[PDB]
Amino acid sequence: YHVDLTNCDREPIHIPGYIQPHGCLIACDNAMRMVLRHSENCGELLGLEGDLNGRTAEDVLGKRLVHDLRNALTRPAMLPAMETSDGRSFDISLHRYKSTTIIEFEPSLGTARKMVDRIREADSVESLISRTTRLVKATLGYDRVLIYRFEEDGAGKVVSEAKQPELESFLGQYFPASDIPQQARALYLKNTLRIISDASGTPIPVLPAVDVSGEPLDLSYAHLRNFSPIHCEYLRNMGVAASMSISVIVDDALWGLIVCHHCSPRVLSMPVRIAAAMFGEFFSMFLQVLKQKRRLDTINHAHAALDRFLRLAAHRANLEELLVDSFQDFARLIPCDGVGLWVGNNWHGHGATPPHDAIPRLARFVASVSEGRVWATHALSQAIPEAEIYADTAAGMLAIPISQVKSDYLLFFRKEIVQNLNWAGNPEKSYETGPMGDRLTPRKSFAIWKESVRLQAQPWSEADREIAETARIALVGVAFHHSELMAGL
Ligand SMILES: *C/C=C1/C(=C/C2=NC(=C\c3[nH]c(/C=C4/NC(=O)C(C=C)=C4C)c(C)c3CCC(=O)O)/C(CCC(=O)O)=C2C)NC(=O)[C@H]1C
């Protein structure tokens, strides 16, 4: 077995058989009686000799320490400043997973509260995320701090950045979903924090990698777990020697990551990591609440806007004329780059929309698939091949029925997503490569993403769809109310 670009999507990164060099690791049985595995550097760090496997935990660590560890017993217990029998001092991380006890040893001020105080008053998602990269960079001292937000398809967008002036910007850039494989996302979801202390360091083998019964050691919750050589190469091509990531959990899902990159080796001590993880939890909670508030404000605004229109309709004899005069104002309901009105087989457009002569084909399509419901796509050329030609202007379409009887619609459009990019990076910046080649570089990642979203628009969110359904009911309703008046006209 060797990992490469053909099979890295399935790399079993939870069982790498190695740890990072800034600590050592002992695996014991579920009762913590016997040593089953140990990293090769345990002898050096703990002051021991030969094969530790088979020796008892007490033999290896001391009765005192084993007692304290048992008492501490999948969320790892953090025990700063513990001592082994001979007086060597360690920050110890202890957990049980799959009924194996894993003990991690690192040879070894109100920070979290003060950091959290500086974000608690953020009053929008942007205000929260902008200040956080700045704050985390200043407090933790990394050369770059980013926040990635995952799109619905899994792609990452770099939504905030604080960096050393001489580093290139990645702000507004996207990376393909495949840049972080599924197993990596599963581990990000399980552990608040992920540390890479030295990307160019030499990893330390776990002894044995595979036990007598054929089982590998599952290091899913071990902070010393080594990382993929694919990512190692990616980091090295970027000039990045160390990282720490904080998982952003919103509504029980992985919303994104706060990622700290350092151009030289770096690892935070256990007490600072505890503070950073606590910060991450509060950041996640506050973000969750701010997203929810923004959604509420958006729905509230839309209802008020629909009421304003209904108020006008109550003083107009001719609803169709009112719609022809007003339809552009519905662009305020749902973010869009254009909007149009298809009523009585005539088209009226505003903003970025398909060309006038393309509309009858589009309207026939909408009438065939709507079935009196909101219908939406962010890949219009997949439904109408001829739409490819105008994808630069209108690649996404959301259609709202506005009559219970006639095939009349209000149509919202969005441009293909590359047209709305706001990328702060340097197009002249290039990257060196290793054996796997230029795939493992930001430049190439971004190019792959751009190619993957050709002819597609930003997807219509659940909130967009909810507003559209409310608008359908309002407009179908008022059309029915005016139907005798319009029959007369
Ligand atoms: C086929 C597998 C691939 C792969 C695997 C891994 N990626 C991991 C982390 C990771 N990779 C990236 C990708 C980036 N794309 C960019 O464009 C960019 C910067 C502009 C970056 C940094 C990211 C964002 C991350 C998240 C951590 C970080 O940002 O430093 C990963 C886990 C590493 C670990 O064990 O902690 C695996 C495994 N990466 C690939 O690119 C493909 C080929």
Author numbering: 6 to 78, 85 to 119, 126 to 506
Q: Please, what does the article write about this entry?
A:
Phytochromes are biliproteins of plants, bacteria and fungi that use red light as a source of information to regulate fundamental physiological processes, such as photosynthesis, seed germination, flowering and shade avoidance. The molecular architecture of phytochromes shares a common photosensory core module (PCM), which is composed of PAS (Per/Arnt/Sim), GAF (cGMP phosphodiesterase/adenyl cyclase/FhlA) and PHY (phytochrome-specific) domain4–6. Bacterial phytochromes can be grouped into prototypical and bathy phytochromes, in which the red-absorbing Pr and far-red-absorbing Pfr are the thermodynamically stable states, respectively. The conjugate Meta-F and Pfr crystal structures has been obtained from the engineered photoactivatable near-IR fluorescent protein (Agp2-PAiRFP2), derived from the bathy phytochrome Agp2 from Agrobacterium fabrum.
Preliminary crystallization and spectroscopic experiments identified the PCM fragment of the photoactivatable phytochrome Agp2-PAiRFP2 as a promising candidate. The half-lives of the photoinduced states of Agp2-FL, Agp2-PCM and the PCM fragment of Agp2-PAiRFP2 are 170 s11, 20 s11 and 233 min, respectively. This Agp2-PCM variant includes 24 substitutions, which except for Val244Phe and Ala276Val do not participate in the interaction between the chromophore and chromophore-binding site. Agp2-PAiRFP2 was crystallized in the dark adapted Pfr state (in the hexagonal space group P6322) and the structure was solved at a resolution of 2.03 Å. Remarkably, crystal packing and crystallization conditions differ significantly from those of Agp2-PCM. While Agp2-PCM shows a parallel orientation of the two crystallographic monomers, Agp2-PAiRFP2 monomers crystallize in a near anti-parallel arrangement. However, the overall topologies of the monomers in both structures agree very well, as demonstrated also by superposition of the equivalent Cα atoms of both constructs yielding a root-mean-square deviation of only 0.6 Å. Also, structural details of the chromophore pocket are very similar, including the ZZEssa stereochemistry of BV and the exocyclic double bond of ring A of the chromophore, which results in sp3 hybridization of the C2 atom and therefore an out-of-plane oriented bond to the methyl group at this position. The chromophore interaction interface to the surrounding amino acids, especially potential hydrogen bonds, hydrophobic interactions and water molecules, are almost identical for the Pfr states of both Agp2-PCM variants. Ultraviolet–visible absorption spectra of Agp2-PAiRFP2 compared to the wild-type Agp2-PCM construct, the full-length Agp2 (Agp2-FL) and the prototypical full-length phytochrome Agp1 (Agp1-FL) display the characteristic spectrum of Pfr but an enhanced stability of the final photoproduct state, resulting in slower dark reversion to Pfr compared to Agp2-PCM.
